[PDB]
């Protein structure tokens, strides 16, 4: 089927360049028009460039003279190449499909985070939340930037998995809980890891909780 | 430039309920080029509506679509709890590509009141010298839910910072975890560590506790 498969997002410096491709599969990018669109975190939809079928390209205003748009037609891939990063520019950017005649947008990549700023990275510090229906989980505290992935038993338990939107502390740094709740008469034999993952430091920690 | 104004911003409906949701352009636009998305929190939007009318691929009937010139509308005929999103529309009948501000939905399902459990910090965390006591109040309805932390009956203010969980796809609950966080001399200077919670789905409020040295 159709896909379109994001990379490049992370952590930049302000006043830094970042480039983001979007790998196609299903369809060609060089005979369709492309487009790349942008969302601000809990902000609206933001078109930021098009690139025709023909190659002829278009960019939103603020973005005009420091963003190219591109493709690899060998590599079935789409590029937006971004210079002179501001704090305005932190989103999560989505490639997508659309139409020349009515440019709406039928297929979108699944989206990449670009967060623009000039504090250090900071791997998060894990501690267990143990029960004493059970409740448990794991406190994924002192990170920077967004996001973490947090998983249980490798992906095995999602059933009741409750991972909440981080916040940020006064110190600048992320925080946030992953609980489960599970039946106690489970609690003795069965074995349950939270599994977090935070890919802008490599930090990968597998933390077991325990009674 | 075309600004589309979606009105209304929030919309709260229960399940069954019809949902009509509007969409006014500043100019004349085009039928055959306005659109909707449906954007579901940590996904893309998906394309719903073309061209003001016609449904996407593997869009449910109770979709659709209609409107002319400057006013545009999509209903969902029968909301379903996995309805929960924010709906955009979408105009290039004249550029720029401009979106509306969206319409966030929820799903106003019944009263259902929290499970409310508290967690001690853990002793790896104390290493570091701070202690951060974590309220969990597990699936809920409404949003509104009031968490107040007692230290040895003391009120504390300042002190914590409160999450929610984006309303669930299946039962239309929330969930609310509470931090109260305290260096570590001065939580093993106390006792007594209470989250009281006030909420529509409770008669009364609810407080659970834990002795530090218990």
């Known amino acids: 089927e159709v896909q379109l498969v994001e990379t490049g997002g992370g952590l930049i410096q302000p006043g830094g360049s970042l480039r983001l491709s979007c790998a196609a599969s299903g369809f060609t990018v060089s005979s369709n028009y492309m487009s790349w669109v942008r969302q601000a975190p809990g902000k609206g939809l933001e078109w930021v460039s098009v690139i025709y079928s023909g190659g002829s390209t278009y960019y939103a205003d603020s973005v005009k003279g420091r963003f190219t748009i591109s493709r690899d037609n060998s590599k079935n891939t789409l590029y937006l190449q971004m210079n002179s990063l501001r704090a305005e520019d932190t989103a999560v950017y989505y490639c997508?499909?659309?139409?020349?005649?009515?440019?709406?947008?039928?297929?979108w990549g699944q989206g990449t985070l670009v967060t623009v700023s000039s504090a250090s990275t900071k791997g998060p510090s894990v501690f267990p939340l143990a029960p004493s229906t059970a409740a448990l989980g794991c406190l994924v505290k002192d990170y920077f930037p967004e996001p973490v992935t947090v998983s249980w038993n490798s992906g095995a338990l999602t059933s009741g998995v409750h991972t909440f939107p981080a916040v940020l502390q006064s110190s600048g740094l992320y925080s946030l809980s992953s609980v489960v709740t599970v039946p106690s008469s489970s609690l003795g034999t069965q074995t349950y890891i939270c599994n977090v993952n935070h890919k802008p430091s490599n930090t990968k920690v597998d933390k077991k909780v325990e009674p | 430039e075309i600004v589309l104004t979606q009105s209304p911003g929030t919309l709260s409906l229960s399940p069954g309920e019809r949902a009509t949701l509007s969409c006014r352009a500043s100019?004349?636009?085009?039928?055959?080029?306005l659109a909707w998305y449906q954007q579901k929190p940590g996904q893309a939007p998906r394309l719903l509506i073309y061209?003001?009318?016609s449904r996407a691929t593997g869009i449910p009937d109770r979709f659709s679509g209609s409107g002319s010139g400057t006013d545009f509308t999509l209903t969902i005929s029968r909301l379903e709890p996995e309805d929960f999103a924010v709906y955009y529309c979408?105009?290039?009948?004249?550029?720029?590509?401009?979106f509306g501000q969206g319409t966030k939905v929820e799903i106003k399902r019944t009263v259902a009141a929290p499970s409310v459990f508290i967690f001690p910090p853990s002793d790896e965390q104390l290493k570091s010298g701070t202690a951060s006591v974590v309220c969990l109040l597990n699936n809920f309805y409404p949003r509104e839910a009031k968490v107040q932390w007692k230290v040895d009956n003391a009120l504390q203010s300042g002190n914590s910072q409160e999450s929610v969980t984006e309303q669930d796809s299946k039962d239309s609950t929330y969930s609310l975890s509470s931090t109260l966080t305290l260096s570590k001399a001065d939580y093993e200077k106390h006792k007594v560590y209470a989250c009281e919670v006030t909420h529509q789905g409770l008669s009364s409020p609810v407080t659970k506790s834990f002795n530090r040295g218990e």
């Open positions: 979408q105009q290039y009948g004249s550029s720029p590509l401009t």
């Open positions: 997508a499909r659309y139409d020349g005649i009515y440019g709406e947008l039928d297929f």
């Open positions: 061209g003001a009318s």
């Open positions: 100019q004349s636009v085009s039928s055959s080029y």
